[PDB]
Design a protein around this ligand. Structure first.
Ligand SMILES: *[C@@H]1O[C@H](CO)[C@@H](O[C@@H]2O[C@H](CO)[C@@H](O[C@@H]3O[C@H](CO)[C@@H](O)[C@H](O)[C@@H]3O)[C@H](O)[C@H]2NC(C)=O)[C@H](O)[C@H]1NC(C)=O
Ligand SMILES: *[C@@H]1O[C@H](CO)[C@@H](O[C@@H]2O[C@H](CO)[C@@H](O[C@@H]3O[C@H](CO)[C@@H](O)[C@H](O)[C@@H]3O)[C@H](O)[C@H]2NC(C)=O)[C@H](O)[C@H]1NC(C)=O
Ligand SMILES: *[C@@H]1O[C@H](CO)[C@@H](O)[C@H](O)[C@H]1NC(C)=O
Ligand SMILES: *[C@@H]1O[C@H](CO)[C@@H](O)[C@H](O)[C@H]1NC(C)=O
Ligand SMILES: *[C@@H]1O[C@H](CO)[C@@H](O)[C@H](O)[C@H]1NC(C)=O
Ligand SMILES: *[C@@H]1O[C@H](CO)[C@@H](O)[C@H](O)[C@H]1NC(C)=O
Ligand SMILES: *[C@@H]1O[C@H](CO)[C@@H](O)[C@H](O)[C@H]1NC(C)=O
Ligand SMILES: *[C@@H]1O[C@H](CO)[C@@H](O)[C@H](O)[C@H]1NC(C)=O
Ligand SMILES: *[C@@H]1O[C@H](CO)[C@@H](O)[C@H](O)[C@H]1NC(C)=O
Ligand SMILES: *[C@@H]1O[C@H](CO)[C@@H](O)[C@H](O)[C@H]1NC(C)=O
Ligand SMILES: [Ca+2]
Ligand SMILES: [Ca+2]
Ligand SMILES: [Ca+2]
Ligand SMILES: [Ca+2]
Ligand SMILES: [Cl-]
Ligand SMILES: [Cl-]
Ligand SMILES: [Cl-]
Ligand SMILES: [Cl-]
Ligand SMILES: [Cl-]
Ligand SMILES: [Cl-]
Ligand SMILES: [Cl-]
Ligand SMILES: [Cl-]
Ligand SMILES: [Cl-]
Ligand SMILES: [Cl-]
Ligand SMILES: [Cl-]
Ligand SMILES: [Cl-]
Ligand SMILES: [Cu+2]
Ligand SMILES: [Cu+2]
Ligand SMILES: [Mg+2]
Ligand SMILES: [Mg+2]
Ligand SMILES: [Mg+2]
Ligand SMILES: [Mg+2]
Ligand SMILES: [Mg+2]
Ligand SMILES: [Mg+2]
Ligand SMILES: [Xe]
Ligand SMILES: [Xe]
Ligand SMILES: [Xe]
Ligand SMILES: [Xe]
Ligand SMILES: [Xe]
Ligand SMILES: [Xe]
Ligand SMILES: [Xe]
Ligand SMILES: [Xe]
Ligand SMILES: [Xe]
Ligand SMILES: [Xe]
Ligand SMILES: [Xe]
Ligand SMILES: [Xe]
Ligand SMILES: [Xe]
Ligand SMILES: [Xe]
Ligand SMILES: [Xe]
Ligand SMILES: [Xe]
Lengths: 735, 735
């Protein structure tokens, strides 16, 4: 007999998604208004002296107006755009952030400087510390080719590396290094061997260079240094001549004829493991899908949870208005920034401190059905706007119900067994940013717990192994390859509003203590106690997870209690990857990523403290648009709207198990938000996905209660994934 | 079209399972020899002055003889039994451990004192610190009834608690408290309200008592104290008379008429959540099972892994000869002990320091098919012997292939996407020990990684909430109920033999450092470095996981390297629950659990250091059979057979989310064993469970390579679990 089929369920969201990305039509109206207001050049025709548009996206509503709309029948918040435009028509070039609205475009619409969420109080980012945009990238690539493809340098490179200039690629370290004291902007660079399989990061040559790129006039840019085997040369001629001498040491060259060790996919001449000719297990939905959605509003419901999603170019997916059993628990949950900070003996990796939101986390590729997500997943389309084009991205994120490999709870005793299954709602997106693949998962449980996790995979940014200097910074993982040591750190804005906005943050500290008890006078016991301590003010040092896990961190309602007098609370519980940066004082990130130095921070919510980083931060080393430390000014948190900024990380020291790629299983970080006296009891008990087995002692009869779930054998069709929907590329573009 | 069916595959183990439990026939021969050698009384007729048999099990082979058999065509090790017999026929009673073999019983068979694995050098455990066996339990229960069911005490109890003696149960704290200085043995106790649903732990009355139980003559045992509202009474009469006075404070009584808050299973009058009338997702095997086994030898193979299992009464499942790609990586992996140590204002919980192996972890209940394990699982039968009966336990552990909710790795770039699925082999057993349910999972991955995890659920051991004294030890979670604060700590013996037995233990320490580089003279950089440090000797302090995760712990081959010169290694990587005891100096566990004070210990392998605890430890407070600290005697680990003793734990402070039961999702601990330069590369690349997608730039054609896996739609029957195989109880017994 066939399993009972059910159709996918669609619902109407309670409210409008006021956080959603701009519609194509809204972007068009904004772009038109900009073109009519300013002299805007198309990006394909633009240079450092043109004006052109970079970005146009939603300027999300402020919280109080949002909550008045959601909870108190207020007006829709004004619909506005944030745009970033490069202005090069003046004596000095700069990027400027501008607000355009309200939308749709009407007689009330204005264009104004936008700076309220920048701690530095500026709408304008100077050229010298500007975004590494398509224009600046093209100029740098042209400048490098001009210098490295001369007759002499062609010879220097081939002689040192072993392949001609055509067979390598030269490129610059990020961030650039602007010195506000001198006005100079310099950058380092290296070369990697070209590959057919995107494995250039595994073949670094150990040839380095340094250049000055100060000012908008590229005719004045100059190569400063060539660096090779830890020696500095101040001209091509000096290096060429050094190489002709008999005392010159040339480091071992990459074996470019044998690069099969860089290849990810299966070698079809490899033997197959026993039984690997049988397909691996599959998750199926015997009675159809158990989550619902509003397609227009990107609102989701599952087992008494509800939330809206939003998408941005900088960060990818965000969540708003997360409710459980009819009560908002989180106003905003949003990934803010991802960094990768390397330590090295060499001037390329030692100067690498990536800000992934500068590149964009939300402007990448589709998910591969069946593999990136289970075949039971639903897929959603999002969009972004960059450089004159609207990008529609299908299969951008997925939603699926998992069956976890362990039950949610159980007990056996007194002639019964009671077990509850553990289905979870899962939202995933994957962001492949060059070499790295980041896999983001949000997992919701039946009791009101949410787990936020990240895993990493892809190609490592390796380094040339120099036996004299490389050992303190990495392991030798191939003939001339070091697995360069680096930190990954990610920041999440977790705007918990537990039993309303007015909250307190507390910790239950656990300690061993010597006590005497009234029932055994004179006898000292070494025992353990808890002590509740309130986080009364913003702490500049942040909060690091306690030694030996001897504490619990809570966000409590300031006024609401459960039936036993306990403040309603949620526990922020670290899972794996509760680490922060090792390095304290980076020349490549002095003030640009100051949230990354502790496990977590608690601040008073402000609309002006929207975000802990920006896409414009990375090259603004000393005066970034957002300096996170500006948020930390000793404000009372004692009965206030608190935001937690929670970090996840990994200290990655690649070894053989990272070649050809890093694996997701061991590169993992997570935290949980779990109810703590939030209810009077554990709130999964109403699920039907449980069994109650009883045995009668006298009659020797067993009884099985399955609460309406029929476990009888039935037939299902195991459906083919929507593979046809997957095409390579970073979105379908429309100029 | 129907999915291609395949039958379950059975294989022949490479060798005999020399670690397997005794056959019924072996146990019978041993029991017969004991009965012919000594005057043995049946346990149902026995007292403190009889002799009777407690336990008969396999005395596992010593390592060198085992390895000679497995690897060098040696003889089968001798087949021996360990038995424990209580001898009460002498002037003083004691338990004695005895070796019986070789088996089968022949003219060569002897019975000898067995003590080699006891650090205290004794085969005999004195009565005073004896096992809490069926005989001693019965005597204590009889003694308590004699004292608490008198006319006066019946009145005292009803008056204080609110229900008659028939409606409560009184019982003693574990461990007992023997004082070797005085020879006295005392114990504390309390009463809980009787329930129909095994929820007595949620209804503690706050009535306590203390008794002296010194010696085998129960006529000399005496009640010492009654303790109530933090006052001590030295007779029933004193307390009765105190209660008649007008100044007497009676603490608030349990509302025994309203205990629905203790009930686990669904209330069928509760509303159903949206779409919870659809069955939750199911894992299926479209082309059948992909692991194989030898049923007689309990040998398992899956995707180039192999191992044997063994079962014991004390600990449940153990693993031996774990190999991956034809090489042993772990000789022995075995759970050793589980403790639960409470802190409290009251004399019951403050004296509770459970040793779960004393009760037995491997003598519990069957798994519930479909709920405890996926319906695709295979189930295995094990056995134990206790008190004259052989117990056959069906559905004792399960083996299943999961599909993890994330892929093992991926990369997108250069017009391809390459993704590998993440199937894992999973071995589970669940041990419900009274109130607690422990869920043990061993998860094997395609690359050679193994994850060991535990989750906990069940009823908490709560405490009576006294507003004057309870607050430092727990939260008030119901009207008169405290969620008593406790540590769970579990010890695993992890006998890694990485590239042979001769190994080294090392750590890569991570630190920030200020350096100057040859390519930028005079410029100080704050960067980060690694430093390899060898653990040259056994450290009495053990090893605690590093602050901010700034280190990697390795077990390395002493001589074998990979192709790049790195020692072949495995990384012991902490996951969640990397915590140890808070309390340092317990009166209830002075010397009995000394492994629990750090995250992990490294020792030189010895057959005499078989196990870090014993079932006989818990009441032997100062001179236990095994004092783990005896293992730690500063021996060189520099090119030696190393064993790692790895702890997992939880500091549990129950809140509302633990009523009516604790949930498995948030009560979790794990560690991973992962290859680290063990191969030249990451070793999952040969799996067929992957996709290679390519896109041609010119022809606009996509190609999908699925390596023999057909994702076409097909029909399967979703099978009913083997529910008929599940019967309540702790094994089918045979006298
Ligand atoms: C959301 O909240 C933020 C923070 O409260 C609001 O920021 C404010 O934006 C206005 C413009 O709409 C800024 O006013 C301007 O100030 C400059 C500086 O003197 C002045 O030259 C202009 O004439 C104008 O008055 C204001 O400074 C800024 N406030 C802060 C604290 O930075 C924002 O308006 C809110 N958005 C919405 C949709 O209501
Ligand atoms: C596995 O290895 C252990 C540890 O090496 C062996 O333990 C040894 O067991 C023997 C008995 O078989 C003990 O010998 C006895 O010693 C006592 C004490 O003086 C003596 O009275 C007896 O006459 C007898 O000689 C021996 O002490 C003990 N060794 C240690 C270090 O404690 C065990 O025999 C091995 N098992 C197998 C199956 O080979
Ligand atoms: C717009 O800018 C370009 C330079 O990019 C300039 O040549 C042109 O004259 C400007 N248009 C107007 C109307 O001033
Ligand atoms: C580099 O120089 C060679 C000739 O010296 C030329 O053929 C080639 O096109 C140049 N490459 C680029 C990208 O300019
Ligand atoms: C495939 O396997 C063969 C045989 O081991 C090996 O020589 C070759 O390097 C492999 N090819 C690739 C591209 O991985
Ligand atoms: C984006 O793609 C979706 C799905 O194909 C489609 O509904 C929508 O019209 C697209 N948007 C635009 C403006 O191309
Ligand atoms: C065996 O022990 C019992 C006491 O438990 C005793 O009465 C009996 O006589 C003993 N048997 C022999 C043969 O001595
Ligand atoms: C307790 O005492 C009462 C009479 O006082 C009696 O009826 C009952 O059987 C006793 N219970 C036990 C278990 O001895
Ligand atoms: C079932 O639900 C009803 C209505 O809320 C409640 O009164 C009762 O306590 C519940 N019964 C049990 C046994 O949980
Ligand atoms: C234990 O149970 C298994 C499975 O039912 C059976 O094969 C075996 O004979 C049983 N052992 C004994 C001795 O009862
Ligand atoms: Ca908040
Ligand atoms: Ca502040
Ligand atoms: Ca070993
Ligand atoms: Ca030792
Ligand atoms: Cl400005
Ligand atoms: Cl110019
Ligand atoms: Cl090479
Ligand atoms: Cl879909
Ligand atoms: Cl407190
Ligand atoms: Cl700056
Ligand atoms: Cl002895
Ligand atoms: Cl007696
Ligand atoms: Cl009550
Ligand atoms: Cl089975
Ligand atoms: Cl080192
Ligand atoms: Cl003792
Ligand atoms: Cu990394
Ligand atoms: Cu617990
Ligand atoms: Mg609508
Ligand atoms: Mg839209
Ligand atoms: Mg109006
Ligand atoms: Mg056989
Ligand atoms: Mg057997
Ligand atoms: Mg022989
Ligand atoms: Xe657009
Ligand atoms: Xe140069
Ligand atoms: Xe997946
Ligand atoms: Xe949440
Ligand atoms: Xe990460
Ligand atoms: Xe904490
Ligand atoms: Xe991370
Ligand atoms: Xe990560
Ligand atoms: Xe037996
Ligand atoms: Xe007493
Ligand atoms: Xe499960
Ligand atoms: Xe392993
Ligand atoms: Xe646990
Ligand atoms: Xe470590
Ligand atoms: Xe644990
Ligand atoms: Xe646990």
């Amino acid at each position: 007999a066939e399993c009972v089929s059910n159709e996918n369920v669609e619902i109407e969201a309670p409210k409008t998604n006021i956080w959603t990305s701009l519609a194509k039509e809204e972007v068009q109206e904004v772009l038109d208004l900009l073109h009519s207001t300013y002299n805007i050049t198309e990006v394909t025709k633009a240079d450092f002296f043109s004006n052109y548009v970079l970005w146009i996206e939603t300027l999300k509503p402020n919280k109080t107006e949002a909550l008045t709309y959601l909870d108190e029948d207020g007006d829709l918040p004004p619909r506005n755009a944030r745009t970033v435009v490069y202005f090069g028509e003046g004596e000095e070039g700069y990027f400027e952030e501008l607000k355009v609205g309200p939308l749709p475009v009407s007689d009330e619409t204005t264009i104004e400087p936008l700076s309220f969420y920048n701690t530095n109080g500026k709408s304008k980012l100077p050229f010298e510390v500007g975004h590494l945009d398509r224009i600046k990238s093209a100029a740098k690539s042209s400048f490098l080719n001009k210098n490295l493809n001369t007759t002499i340098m062609r010879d220097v490179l081939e002689g040192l590396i072993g392949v001609p200039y055509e067979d390598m690629g030269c490129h610059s370290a990020a961030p650039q290094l602007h010195d506000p004291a001198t006005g100079a902007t310099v950058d380092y660079g290296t070369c990697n061997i070209n590959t057919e399989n995107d494995a250039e990061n595994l073949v670094p040559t150990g040839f380095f260079f340094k250049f000055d790129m100060t000012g908008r006039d590229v005719s004045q840019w100059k190569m400063l240094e060539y660096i090779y085997n830890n020696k500095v040369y101040t001209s091509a001629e000096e290096l060429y001549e050094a190489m002709q001498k008999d005392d010159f040491v040339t480091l071992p060259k990459i074996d470019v004829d044998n690069l099969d060790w860089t290849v990810i996919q299966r070698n079809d001449s490899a033997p197959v493991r026993h039984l690997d000719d049988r397909k691996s297990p599959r998750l199926v939905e015997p009675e159809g899908r158990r989550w619902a959605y509003d397609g227009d509003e990107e609102y989701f419901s599952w087992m008494d949870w509800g939330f809206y999603t939003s998408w941005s170019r900088d960060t990818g997916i965000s969540f708003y208005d997360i409710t459980f059993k009819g009560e908002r628990i989180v106003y905003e949950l949003s990934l803010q920034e991802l960094i990768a900070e390397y330590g090295s003996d060499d001037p390329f990796n030692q100067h690498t401190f990536y800000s992934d939101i500068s590149y964009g986390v939300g402007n990448r590729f589709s998910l591969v059905p069946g593999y990136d997500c289970p075949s039971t997943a639903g897929y959603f389309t999002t969009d972004t706007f960059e450089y004159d084009e609207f990008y529609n991205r299908t299969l951008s994120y997925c939603v699926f119900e998992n069956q976890e490999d362990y039950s949610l709870l159980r007990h056996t005793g007194a002639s019964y067994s009671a077990i509850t299954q553990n289905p979870t709602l899962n939202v995933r997106f994957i962001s492949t940013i060059g070499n790295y693949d980041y896999n983001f998962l949000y997992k919701f449980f039946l009791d009101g717990t949410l787990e936020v996790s990240v895993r990493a995979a892809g190609y490592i940014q390796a380094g040339y192994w120099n036996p004299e200097t490389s050992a303190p910074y990495g392991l030798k993982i191939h003939d001339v390859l070091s697995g360069s040591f680096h930190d990954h750190v990610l920041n999440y804005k977790v705007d918990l509003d537990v039993g309303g906005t007015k909250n307190r943050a507390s910790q239950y500290v656990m300690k061993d203590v010597d006590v005497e008890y009234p029932w055994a006078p004179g006898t000292v016991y070494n025992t353990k106690q808890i002590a509740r301590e309130v986080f009364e003010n913003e702490d500049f040092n942040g909060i690091n997870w306690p030694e030996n896990g001897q504490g619990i961190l809570l966000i409590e309602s300031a006024e609401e209690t459960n039936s036993f007098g306990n403040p309603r609370a949620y526990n922020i519980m670290p899972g794996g990857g509760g680490v922060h940066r090792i390095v304290k004082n980076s020349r490549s990130g002095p003030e640009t990523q100051n949230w990354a130095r502790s496990n977590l921070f608690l601040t008073k919510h402000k609309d002006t403290e929207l975000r802990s980083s920006t896409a414009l931060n990375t090259n603004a080393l000393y005066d970034p648009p957002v300096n996170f430390n500006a948020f930390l000014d000793d404000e009372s948190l004692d009965g206030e709207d608190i935001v937690a900024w929670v970090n996840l990380g990994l200290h990655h020291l690649p070894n053989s198990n990272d070649l050809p790629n890093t694996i997701f299983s061991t590169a993992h970080a997570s935290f949980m938000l779990t109810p703590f006296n939030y209810f009077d009891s554990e709130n999964s008990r109403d699920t039907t996905q449980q069994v109650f087995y009883t045995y009668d002692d006298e009659t020797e009869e067993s009884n099985w209660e399955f609460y309406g779930n029929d476990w009888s054998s039935c037939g299902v069709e195991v459906a083919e994934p929507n593979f046809e929907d997957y095409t390579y590329g970073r979105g379908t573009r429309i100029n």
